[PDB]
């Protein structure tokens, strides 16, 4: 889906499979967090479905020894003194000592400030202990979390449930057309993007000899040249678009290991899973009611959440019993208008826009004369069309698909291409669609705050600030204090501080809140990037202080208050909203759950050959399953006729469904239901 998903995939640790255990053979004890998982397996990143606890993610600094156990690094404490000597310990080796927490107050020499410090002990015991007892200590605060989990800013302010959901939804992000790095970051995005392998890093230092959208040539110091080819508009597996773009220009000195080109979900070498959106936390006329999301149409006009998707369609011409299927433009009883987008071979041409139902590959298959309906043979006789012993089996566009044909691949047995035995030709057509954000598409943040798009108002309907800039997204306030994900609020505040910038009062010394902040943070330009490491980073005191010294806009006016709220104007009426509303910038990701794929409907269609019931799934053009509980609902209502209609003429009544269709097209009334074919099959099996 995105580079982070692939990295996380390559770092998965599952308990299922041969030699492990069965899913039916896994109690509530194999799945829950174990105290030995500290710094080895993440206690957050794990699915919430039936595979919960059975599938974890390796911790950041963890590694595997040749024996098979997972080692984690620790700083060796000699005599109550922290040393830079680092050693990897296994689980039982860790249990044979006691380790201090990463965020321990440490002297500049290495001695612990407090005699008693929070220390972990075997059998998962947490307690204070003298400073002369600490044997080792943690390397980094984020030592226990996974790569995806370490990418959640203010993770220490989110409960484990919504943190799990945020880490799991980061892997569902869709690569957008253009990518923006988040204003509020954690520092992990860079290494995640580089180690994922979907960017282009320079192997050896040198200068850029020639840069193009196709490739980048690097002239090394020794004299050799290395050329990296860009992967452009490649179907990235799950249908996403893996597209790499050069970053450097002509004649730029680049060091070894530096990113010279970044791919999907990447901005200057950092993971860009979403966009920075101006968010206001307020209910708005019920369109954001319980987890629904209101968006500004600007995100549609400016392609802020627009994504490219590519689908692969495939068909083959084989050898049949009465001849051989041939791919030809000549299709029986088709006008020259439907075949207008096809070349002389019967293949759709590159660049043609194809809706659903359009022909992609024109294939005809010879059908025998003894396989003809009496009505079909009469209809062939009353039209004089002889020599049409072939029927149409062309490759058409499925329901819900529409885009531009970007690539064609043809494999012919005639042209030495090795096809499976019995196949004469094979065609693959790649169709690309440019999907703008739509009502019902699922957006989400990094703190497990998910929701679908309930309304996309015009840019003037949006509650706009004092200077007229309308907000981009409206999030309901009710769905914030229940989930215990205050991070999204904090990320908002800091977010705005990153967008506007700040300047701490330097006169009369450094203020008491900014005493712990680095000197690089006392001044910030607008649109600055910051890092809030997990279990470290910004504290609420420094955030409250930053909100008080936010930089003014171009007119010299401060739009948000020290509380973090701002005065908004109702774009529909004009009257300003009675109370200030929290306004900031939040990083929103577009998840791979779009209505363009999830919408489905069926009048009639294919039926399973054995049970004579409608097919299942959207891809097979099937219908919905009226299950057992739904039948209980019908019976509770007393809707006898509706239930009988559902289970007979609308499902597996072989003669009833056709007569119902005829009665509808004739204007007649609905006939009487017959006997289900599945019951006949049941009797024939009992026999």
């Amino acid at each position: 889906n995105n580079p982070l998903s692939g990295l996380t995939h390559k770092r998965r640790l599952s308990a299922l499979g041969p030699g492990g255990l069965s899913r039916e053979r896994a109690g509530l004890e194999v799945r829950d967090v174990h105290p030995s998982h500290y710094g080895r397996m993440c206690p957050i990143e794990t699915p919430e479905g039936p595979n919960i606890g059975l599938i974890g993610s390796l911790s950041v600094y963890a590694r595997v020894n040749p024996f098979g156990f997972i080692e984690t690094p620790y700083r060796k404490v000699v005599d109550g003194v922290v040393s830079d000597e680092i050693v990897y310990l296994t689980a039982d080796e860790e249990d044979r000592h006691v380790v201090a927490q990463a965020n321990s107050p440490i002297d500049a020499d290495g001695r612990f400030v407090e005699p008693r410090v929070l220390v972990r002990r075997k059998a998962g015991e947490v307690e204070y202990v003298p400073s002369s007892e600490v044997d080792y200590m943690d390397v980094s605060p984020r030592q226990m979390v996974s790569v995806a989990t370490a990418m959640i800013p203010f993770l220490e302010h989110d409960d484990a449930n919504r943190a799990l959901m945020g880490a799991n939804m980061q892997r569902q992000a869709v690569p957008l057309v253009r990518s923006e790095a988040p204003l509020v970051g954690t520092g992990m995005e860079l290494r995640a993007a580089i180690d994922a392998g979907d960017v282009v890093v320079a192997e050896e230092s040198g200068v850029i000899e020639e840069v193009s959208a196709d490739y980048i040539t690097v002239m090394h110091d020794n004299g050799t040249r290395r050329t990296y080819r860009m992967r452009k508009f490649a179907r990235s597996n799950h249908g996403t678009c893996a597209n790499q773009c050069p970053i450097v220009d002509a004649g730029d000195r680049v060091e070894a290991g530096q990113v010279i080109a970044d791919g999907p979900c990447t901005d200057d070498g950092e993971m860009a899973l979403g966009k920075n959106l101006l968010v206001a936390i307020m209910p708005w006329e019920g369109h954001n009611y319980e987890d629904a999301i209101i968006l500004s149409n600007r995100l549609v006009e400016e392609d802020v959440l627009t994504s490219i998707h590519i689908e692969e369609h495939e068909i083959d011409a084989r050898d049949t019993k009465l001849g051989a299927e041939e791919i030809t433009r000549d299709i029986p009883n088709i006008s020259d208008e439907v075949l207008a987008d096809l070349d002389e071979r019967g293949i759709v041409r590159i660049g043609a826009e194809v809706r659903d139902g359009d022909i992609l590959v024109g294939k005809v298959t010879p059908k025998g004369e003894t396989e003809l309906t009496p009505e079909e043979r009469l209809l062939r006789a009353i039209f004089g069309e002889k020599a049409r012993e072939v029927r149409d089996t062309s490759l058409k566009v499925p329901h819900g698909e529409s885009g531009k044909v970007i690539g064609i691949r043809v494999f012919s047995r005639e042209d030495e291409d090795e096809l499976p035995a019995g196949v004469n030709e094979l065609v693959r057509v790649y169709v690309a669609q440019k999907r703008k954000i739509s009502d019902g598409d699922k957006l989400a943040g990094r703190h497990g705050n998910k929701g679908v798009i309930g309304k996309i108002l015009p840019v003037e309907d949006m509650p706009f600030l004092a200077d007229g800039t309308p907000v981009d997204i409206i999030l309901n306030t009710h769905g914030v204090p229940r989930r215990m994900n205050i991070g999204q609020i904090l990320e908002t505040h800091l977010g705005w501080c990153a967008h506007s910038g700040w300047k701490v009062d330097a006169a009369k010394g450094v203020p008491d809140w900014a005493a712990r902040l680095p000197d690089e943070l006392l001044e910030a330009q607008p649109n600055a990037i910051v890092s809030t490491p997990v279990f470290d980073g910004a504290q609420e005191a420094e955030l409250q202080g930053l909100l008080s010294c936010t930089l003014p806009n171009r007119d010299g006016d401060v739009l948000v208050d020290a509380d973090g709220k701002a005065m908004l104007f109702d774009g529909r009426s004009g009257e300003p909203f009675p109370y200030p509303v929290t306004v900031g910038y939040m990083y929103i990701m577009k998840l791979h759950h779009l209505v363009d794929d999830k919408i489905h409907a069926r009048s009639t269609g294919p039926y399973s050959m054995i049970t004579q019931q409608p097919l299942g799934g959207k891809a097979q053009f099937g219908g919905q399953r009226f299950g057992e509980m739904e039948c209980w609902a019908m019976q509770a209502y007393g809707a006898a006729y509706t239930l009988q209609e559902l289970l007979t003429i609308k499902s597996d009544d072989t003669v009833g469904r056709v007569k119902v269709y005829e009665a509808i097209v004739k204007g007649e009334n609905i006939p009487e239901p017959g006997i289900p074919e599945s019951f006949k099959v049941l009797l024939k099996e009992l026999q």
Binding site: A102, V139, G187, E255, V259, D268, R516, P518, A528, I529
Partner: peptide, 23 residues
Amino acid sequence: SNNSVPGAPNRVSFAKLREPLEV
């Protein structure tokens, strides 16, 4: 600054604890 080893954009960190071992 955060992650000043490959040549990345200068992301400024709210870090109070030093990183003894890199990822």
